[PDB]
Amino acid sequence: MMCWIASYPKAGGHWLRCMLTSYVTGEPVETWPGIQAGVPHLEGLLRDGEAPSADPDEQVLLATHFTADRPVLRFYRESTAKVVCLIRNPRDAMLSLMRMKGIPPEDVEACRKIAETFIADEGFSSVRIWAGEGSWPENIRSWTDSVHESFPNAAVLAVRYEDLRKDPEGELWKVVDFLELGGRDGVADAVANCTLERMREMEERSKLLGLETTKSLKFMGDDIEKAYADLLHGETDFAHYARLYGYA
Amino acid sequence: MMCWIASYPKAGGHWLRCMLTSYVTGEPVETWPGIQAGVPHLEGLLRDGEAPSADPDEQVLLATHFTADRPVLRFYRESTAKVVCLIRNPRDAMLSLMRMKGIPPEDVEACRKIAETFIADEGFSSVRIWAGEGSWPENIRSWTDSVHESFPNAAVLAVRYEDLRKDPEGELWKVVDFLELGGRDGVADAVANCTLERMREMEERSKLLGLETTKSLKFMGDDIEKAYADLLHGETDFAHYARLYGYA
C-alpha cells in the first residue's frame, strides 16, 4: 500500500526524507539525489513524466507538497494506506523563504513584501516556486481532518518540525514505527547521518560534483508583528491549526 | 477521445497551439495564458497537480514534449485517438535554444558548448529546462512509427514547422481537418490572429500586465559544421528522421 510524507513547503521535508532514506538504507546518504531516490517527491517524478504505480503490492513511500485533493493524486485514492503529515511553525516557514531566496535581514523593504503576501495568502500561494500546495491550513486540513475525502482508507500521523528538532531519535521512531519500517535500533544512526552539519556538507559536496541540488518578525516593523498576531489569534482555519499544533 | 499536439522543444508548439485556440475560439488570443487554456500543455497541468480525465466522452486536445512512452501518459493509453506530431529542423531547434537563452552570435565559446552537447545527445537531453522529452529521433519515433506501442488506437499526422511557415492557412487546415474541429472558413482568421508580429505584441502585453510568460551553423567554426554534417548524414535514427522530413 501507498504512503505519503506530506508537508507544506519549508516544513523540513528534505531532512525527514533524508533521515527515512538513511534509516531504510542503514547507510548515510552520499549525494543529494539520494533523497529523491529514497523517498521520491511526486512533483519531481511528474516533471520527468514518471508516475508511480497505483495500487502497488508492497509498501511505497512517496512525498509531496500538494494538498491531498489535487486531481493528480486521485489515482492513489483507494491505495493510500498511510500519511505522515510534517508540520512547521508558519512564522519560520515565512522566514525560511526569505533565507532560501538570499534576502538578508536588512532588506526590510523586500522582506515586508514577502510577509504581507504570506499573511494575506495564509501561506505560499503567490510564490511561483511551488504549485498546488494551497494555503497552510488548507494543506493541513486536506492531509489530516479531511484526509478521508481524498484517501478513504488512510490513517494519519502528524509530526511537528519543532518536536523533530528537540528530540530527533524519539520523534523519528514514532514515524519509523507508524510506517512499519522496522526496529528502533537503526534510528540513532539515521539521526546522526543527517544533522544540519552533515546535510550542508553533503549538499555542498553534491553541488560541487555537478549534481542537481535544492528568529522573529520584530526586526521587520511592529505593524507586521500586529498583522501576523491578528491572523495568528483571529477566527480563520489558519488560527485553528496554529493553536492545535502549539504555534499561538 | 483524447488528442495530442506532440512536439519536441522549440518546434513551434506555442504558435500551433495559439492558432488552434483562436481557430476554436473564432477570436484572437488576448493574453499568453490563453494558450495554456486553449490547448493545455500536460507538463503545465502536472506542475499544478492537475491531471485531465482518462477516457473523456467528448474530444480533448492536449499538448506535450514528453515521448509517447513516458509512464505518466499510460493513463491515456486506450483513450488516445489522434496525434498531431509537430516537427522542426534540428539545426534551427539548436539555434532556438541559443536565442531563448539570450546568447548572441558572438559568444562563440558558449554557443559551441550548446551545439556540441546537442550533437552528442542528438537533442536536448542535457538541457535542464525540459524533462522526459528524450532525444529528437526518440521523440519522433515514439509519436509516429512506434505510436501504437504507447497508444494502440491512435492515428497520427505529422506537420513540419517549415511547411506551416511557408503556407500557414494550407497546413493549419490539414491539422484542423484531421482533428475534425470544423470547416476551413475560420482558418484564415486563425493564421492572421497569430503571426510572429501579433504573437510578440501579445507576449509583451502579457509580461507587462504581470501575467506569466514563456540561419546557419557556419558562424561557429567549420569543425561544428562537420560534426553536425557527420551526424546529419550518418547511420543513426537521427539521420533517418532528418532525411524523412527533408532536413538533409
Q: Which residues of B are catalytic?
A: 65
Residue B146 CA to residue B69 CA, distance in Å, equals 9
Q: Are the C-beta atoms of residues B103 and B219 closer than 8 Å to each other?
A: no
Question: Residues B11, B128: one domain?
Answer: no
Query: A50 vs B66: CB contact, 8 Å cut-off?
Result: no
Q: Which residues of A touch B65 (CB under 8 A)?
A: none
3-state secondary structure of B41: strand
Question: Residues A130, A236: one domain?
Answer: yes
Question: Residues B231, B187: one domain?
Answer: no
Question: Residues A206, A229: one domain?
Answer: no
Question: Residues A240, A146: one domain?
Answer: no
Question: Residues A100, A206: one domain?
Answer: no
Q: Please report, in range form, the residues annotated as the binding site of A for 3'-phosphoadenylyl sulfate.
A: 10-15, 88, 96-99, 161, 194-196
Which residue range(s) make up the domain with B66? Answer: 1-88+135-215
The CATH number linked to A159 is: 3.40.50.300
Query: A50 vs B73: CB contact, 8 Å cut-off?
Result: no
Residue B205 CA to residue B198 CA, distance in Å, equals 10
Alpha carbon distances (Å) from B158 to B67, B87, B175:
15, 7, 9
Residue A37 CA to residue A12 CA, distance in Å, equals 17
Specify the DSSP element, H or E, that contains A157.
Answer: strand A155-160
Instruction: Tell which residue, A5, A1, A50, A18, has the closest CA to residue A199.
Output: A18
Question: Residues A146, A193: one domain?
Answer: yes
Q: In this structure, what DSSP letter does residue B12 have? A: S
Question: Residues A80, A164: one domain?
Answer: yes
CA atoms lying within 13 Å on the CB side of residue B63: 23
**Strands laid side by side in the B80-87 sheet:** B60-64, B2-7, B80-87, B155-160
List CB contacts of B235: < 8 A, sequence separation 6 or more. Answer: none
**Strands laid side by side in the A2-7 sheet:** A60-64, A2-7, A80-87, A155-160
Question: Residues A114, A227: one domain?
Answer: yes
Furthest CA-CA distance within chain A:
54
Number of C-beta neighbours around residue A23 at 10 A = 25
Q: What is the CA radius of gyration of chain B?
A: 18
The CATH number linked to A129 is: 1.25.40.460
Resolution of the coordinates in A? 2.6
Instruction: Give catalytic status of residue A240 as yes or no.
Output: no
The set of cell numbers assigned to A101 is 531566496
3-state secondary structure of A62: strand
Q: At what angle do helices B223-232 and B108-121 cross, to 10 degrees?
A: 20
Q: Is B132 annotated as a binding residue?
A: no
Bridge-based pairing of strands A2-7 and A60-64 is parallel
The set of cell numbers assigned to B60 is 480533448
Q: Is B43 annotated as a binding residue?
A: yes
Contact residues, chain B to chain A, C-beta under 8 Å: 43, 46-51, 66-67, 70-75, 128, 131-132, 212
Q: Are the C-beta atoms of residues A144 and A156 closer than 8 Å to each other?
A: yes
Q: Are the C-beta atoms of residues A22 and A15 closer than 8 Å to each other?
A: no
List CB contacts of A9: < 8 A, sequence separation 6 or more. Answer: A65, A93, A97, A124, A127, A129, A130, A133
Alpha carbon distances (Å) from A211 to A20, A32, A214, B126, B128:
21, 8, 10, 12, 12
Number of C-beta neighbours around residue B147 at 10 A = 22
**Closest residue in A to B129 (Cα–Cα):** A47
Q: What is the CA radius of gyration of chain A?
A: 18
**Closest residue in A to B54 (Cα–Cα):** A75
Alpha carbon distances (Å) from A49 to A33, A212, B73:
17, 18, 8
3-state secondary structure of B158: strand
Instruction: Tell which residue, A199, A141, A145, has the closest CA to residue A168.
Output: A199
Q: Is B194 annotated as a binding residue?
A: yes
Question: Residues A180, A198: one domain?
Answer: yes
Q: Which residues of B touch A40 (CB under 8 A)?
A: none
**Closest residue in B to A53 (Cα–Cα):** B71
Residue A225 CA to residue B232 CA, distance in Å, equals 64
Q: Which residues of A touch B71 (CB under 8 A)?
A: 49-51
Question: Residues A103, A29: one domain?
Answer: no
Q: In this structure, what DSSP letter does residue B107 have? A: -
Tell which residues of chain A come right before a gap with C–N over 2.5 A: 214
CA atoms lying within 13 Å on the CB side of residue B156: 21
Handedness of CA A133, A134, A140, A143 (dihedral sign): negative
Residue B85 CA to residue B3 CA, distance in Å, equals 11
The tally of domains found in chain A comes to 2
Task: List the beta strands (DSSP E) in chain B.
Answer: 2-7, 60-64, 80-87, 155-160
Phi, psi of A159 (to 5 degrees): -145, 130
